[PDB]
Design a binder for this molecule. Sequence first.
Ligand SMILES: CCOC(=O)c1c(C)[nH]c(C(=O)N(CC)Cc2ccc3c(c2)OCO3)c1C
Length: 370
Amino acid sequence: GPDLVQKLKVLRHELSLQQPQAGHCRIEVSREEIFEESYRQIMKMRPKDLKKRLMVKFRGEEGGGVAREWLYLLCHEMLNPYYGLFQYSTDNIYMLQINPDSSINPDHLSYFHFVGRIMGLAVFHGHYINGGFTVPFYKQLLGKPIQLSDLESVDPELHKSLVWILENDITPVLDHTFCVEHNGRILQHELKPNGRNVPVTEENKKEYVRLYVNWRFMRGIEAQFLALQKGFNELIPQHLLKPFDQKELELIIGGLDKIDLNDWKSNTRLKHCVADSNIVRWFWQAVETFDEERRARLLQFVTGSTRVPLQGFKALQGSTGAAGPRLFTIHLIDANTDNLPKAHTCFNRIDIPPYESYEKLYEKLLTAVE
Ligand SMILES: CCOC(=O)c1c(C)[nH]c(C(=O)N(CC)Cc2ccc3c(c2)OCO3)c1C
């Protein structure tokens, strides 16, 4: 709380001291080749050059304020799975993770080092990017261990079984060793040296669960993660992150998930209504009134998910029909004003009856959502 506020000020003050008063960090890339061009221009600089005031300009545009736009666009474009560095999770929708098969590109480690530098530059200049990584990824990047509690949301079944180990006498029921498996070929991993020959007992099961928790996230991505963290720490040294505790890191990480209302409203299709009509202004008014958890519940009420792809509301998918985005739709219909708004989750549509006032829309929409 108030100690977190002050820790953030110490961090920002320390970072500001590393920025030279004179000098600039010059970048000039195109929008359609921002990843490859930024890769070559950034990997040419010293870490101290990256700490200079950003001097950015796009391909052939006049545009200071362009450096904010450049960094934000590069932060989202570098996570695009086309580049083979990151892939979507099969545990939670629209979440990202390092692709363990990134070894295909033999220069992958220099690209992960580059991604780390850009993530470090975002923190350095005060940008909050909703990268969509898991809480364990972000804790590890910020220099802290993963907690068993952080596994519950990613892998509830593994979490339940590791919790079972810690809370019960395993002796008459389980016969595990410090060796774990995962995939086409089956790969064995010894959690600690000679692990295959170390049976899990009451005496060492705490170490077993602790090692298994880390492996569940680090599995096949350890070299990639190390290079990423290396780039990140060239901008954000690990000692400056030491004061933040597990709880403060969870608050900072949860704040990254903020739904972008600008991107939501810019990418909303309107059916039988205009952008200035009372029903549409009242809907966006009620959304602004809702806290984050209520904004997430509204997004889940209409789309079935509490998140949107990394590209944003423009990449929103529908369930059926021709391939292509199915934008979030506000549909003003002809219906009973006592009726609730109706969600058509297959098509990301909310059918809204013609309410008389803002206060009636707010209550009906809140009743539908809660
Ligand atoms: C401990 C103090 O934390 C901070 O002050 C802080 C600030 C100012 N920004 C960030 C932050 O946004 N990220 C963490 C690196 C997420 C992120 C950035 C760039 C990305 C990305 C995700 O996906 C690819 O590009 C944090 C945590």
